[PDB]
Amino acid sequence: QLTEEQIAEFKEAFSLFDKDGDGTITTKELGTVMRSLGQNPTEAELQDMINEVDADGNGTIDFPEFLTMMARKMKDTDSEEEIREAFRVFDKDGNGYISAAELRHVMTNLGEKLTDEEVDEMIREADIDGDGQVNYEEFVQMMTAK
Amino acid sequence: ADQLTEEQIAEFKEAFSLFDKDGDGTITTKELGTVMRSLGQNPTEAELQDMINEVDADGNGTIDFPEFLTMMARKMKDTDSEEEIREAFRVFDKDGNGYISAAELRHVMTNLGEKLTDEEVDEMIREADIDGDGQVNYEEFVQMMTAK
Amino acid sequence: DQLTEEQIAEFKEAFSLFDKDGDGTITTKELGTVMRSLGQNPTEAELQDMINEVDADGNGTIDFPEFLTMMARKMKDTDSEEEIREAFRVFDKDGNGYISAAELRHVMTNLGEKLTDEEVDEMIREADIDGDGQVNYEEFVQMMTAK
Amino acid sequence: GSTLFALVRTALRIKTEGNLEQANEELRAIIKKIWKRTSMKLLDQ
Amino acid sequence: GSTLFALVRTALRIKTEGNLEQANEELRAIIKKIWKRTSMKLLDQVVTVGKFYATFLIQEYFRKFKKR
Ligand SMILES: [Ca+2]
Ligand SMILES: [Ca+2]
Ligand SMILES: [Ca+2]
Ligand SMILES: [Ca+2]
Ligand SMILES: [Ca+2]
Ligand SMILES: [Ca+2]
Ligand SMILES: [Ca+2]
Ligand SMILES: [Ca+2]
Ligand SMILES: [Ca+2]
Ligand SMILES: [Ca+2]
Ligand SMILES: [Ca+2]
Ligand SMILES: [Ca+2]
């Protein structure tokens, strides 16, 4: 289920967190990453993160455990019903076409902030017939591929 | 050359590697023939020697990078002169109406033997079309010819 | 009309522009590099013929005595205006009949002259009689057939 | 004679065309990844 | 649980947005290069000249200019 690209991506992410590169992630390395992101976690919160994925209870996180969590949490959302739902919401006005404004809107309600030009680019790539908008069939194809 | 950039030298070095297969720092007639045949050409042993002789400045029979670079720096003319850009524009702008249309660029590329999908062509226009009116004027072309 | 020692010196100055390696002879290769530096692109056969026209002893290159002979002869012949026209074409890069400050700078630079932008504009300004900012053939002639 | 040069120019043209096609493919992959994660995070609401 | 996932997701998102900017800039660079390479290639497409005395005439003019 997990593609070669996904495993590679998650491995890089694991490495970034594994600051000293000793193959395991500690609460401290976790703290460093979070503070670099401007967050201010408590020792309790850091401990909880480790516990959520520490399968062997050794106290730290190795890649296999990191990957297990990612494989499960990052599961593909491509069932017919899931796609149908995502399309219903993307297409805010329900007119059957996802516009730039509509997508550009969703990118805020998710904090997924992108520049106006990038949003337009996402539309273009999904807009197969080039009518400037993304309909149901086009959205489905975009959600199911690779 | 100094008139040449650090990036250009890097490009040329990569180009040189496309011929120096074993990466021993020299291009032999054999390596040259191997590339020429991959390109659909069938050179005679003689024609290959003649090609080497064209740039083999120290006359040792093979082409090293400095010799390769000397030829490239010389042959690769940088169309930066206001005069060069002007004439360049005229060619692209078939009907001379002051704008390069996707249609015109399209012919130009297909004629030159360039392999670009109509989509890549539109991409070239869109990238050059500063004001976004759907075509490329002289000033925009100027910006495209002289940029980062 | 004779050849003053000063005139000979000026001819030597032109000779030296072509004798790039200072070995005392102008070769087809050197003429080639000077012509390309002035906007032209002669073929090897053309370069050879040009050298042959001046090479009196037939050794394949031009020495100063040969260069002087040809230069002194052309100076005497005033009837012709093809020389000035020739000088015009050297400046007129695009060949549109007008010499811009840019085309003038280019030549100056390639002839080993380093005049300030204040002198270049000074030259154009002085030679541009109809005030269009550039020098046409008629203006060039006047500028050249004067001090 | 520019014969060697013409060869180099063609080799580089081919490479450049490859670079363009490869860059477009990467852009398409990134954009698809973003559409999918956006919908993922969306339905997660 | 699921708090470490939110962190990783935040990290990946940043990386992905960076991948996009870099991909866009790479494209602009290649396109610019193609415009240039096409142009210079296109310029090569376009289809008794003594110049000794002419050069002399130019040097003499420069001399006179400096002496005026
Ligand atoms: Ca570690
Ligand atoms: Ca563990
Ligand atoms: Ca809609
Ligand atoms: Ca569409
Ligand atoms: Ca080799
Ligand atoms: Ca050699
Ligand atoms: Ca046109
Ligand atoms: Ca435009
Ligand atoms: Ca010499
Ligand atoms: Ca001689
Ligand atoms: Ca001119
Ligand atoms: Ca004038």
Swiss-Prot record, chain A:
Ca(2+) 1 binds at D18, D20, D22, T24, E29. Ca(2+) 4 binds at D127, D129, D131, Q133, E138. Changing N51I: In CPVT4; increased RYR2 calcium-release channel activity; not changed calcium-dependent inactivation of L-type calcium channel; not changed protein abundance; not changed structure; not changed thermal stability both in the absence and presence of calcium; no effect on the calcium binding affinity; significantly increased binding of RYR2; increased ryanodine-sensitive calcium-release channel activity; decreased of KCNN2 calcium-activated potassium channel activity; not changed KCNN2 expression; not changed KCNN2 location at membrane. The modification Phosphothreonine is found at T42, T108. Gene3D superfamilies: EF-hand. Pfam families: EF-hand_7. There is a cross-link at K19 (Glycyl lysine isopeptide (Lys-Gly) (interchain with G-Cter in SUMO2)). Changing F139L: In LQT14; reduction in calcium affinity; not changed protein abundance; not changed structure; significantly decreased thermal stability in presence of calcium; no effect on RYR2 interaction; significantly reduced ryanodine-sensitive calcium-release channel activity; impaired negative regulation of high voltage-gated calcium channel activity; impaired regulation of cardiac muscle cell action potential and. Ca(2+) 2 binds at D54, D56, N58, T60, E65. It is found in: Cytoplasm, Cytoskeleton, Spindle; Cytoplasm, Cytoskeleton, Spindle pole; Cytoplasm, Cytoskeleton, Microtubule organizing center, Centrosome; Cell projection, Cilium, Flagellum. One of its GO terms (biological process) is negative regulation of high voltage-gated calcium channel activity. PROSITE patterns: EF_HAND_1 (PS00018), EF_HAND_2 (PS50222). This is Calmodulin-1.
From Swiss-Prot, chain E:
It is found in: Cell membrane; Cell membrane, Sarcolemma; Perikaryon; Postsynaptic density membrane. Elevated levels of blood glucose lead to increased phosphorylation by PKA. Coiled coil: none annotated. It comes from the Eukaryota. It is linked to Timothy syndrome: Disorder characterized by multiorgan dysfunction including lethal arrhythmias, webbing of fingers and toes, congenital heart disease, immune deficiency, intermittent hypoglycemia, cognitive abnormalities and autism. Component of a calcium channel complex consisting of a pore-forming alpha subunit (CACNA1C) and ancillary beta, gamma and delta subunits. The channel complex contains alpha, beta, gamma and delta subunits in a 1:1:1:1 ratio, i.e. it contains only one of each type of subunit. CACNA1C channel activity is modulated by ancillary subunits, such as CACNB1, CACNB2, CACNB3, CACNA2D1 and CACNA2D4. Interacts with the gamma subunits CACNG4, CACNG6, CACNG7 and CACNG8. Interacts with CACNB1. Interacts with CACNB2. Identified in a complex with CACNA2D4 and CACNB3. Interacts with CACNB3. Each of the four internal repeats contains five hydrophobic transmembrane segments (S1, S2, S3, S5, S6) and one positively charged transmembrane segment (S4). S4 segments probably represent the voltage-sensor and are characterized by a series of positively charged amino acids at every third position. Binding of intracellular calcium through the EF-hand motif inhibits the opening of the channel. This is Voltage-dependent L-type calcium channel subunit alpha-1C. The gene is CACNA1C. The chain holds residues 1609 to 1682 of 2221 of the full protein.
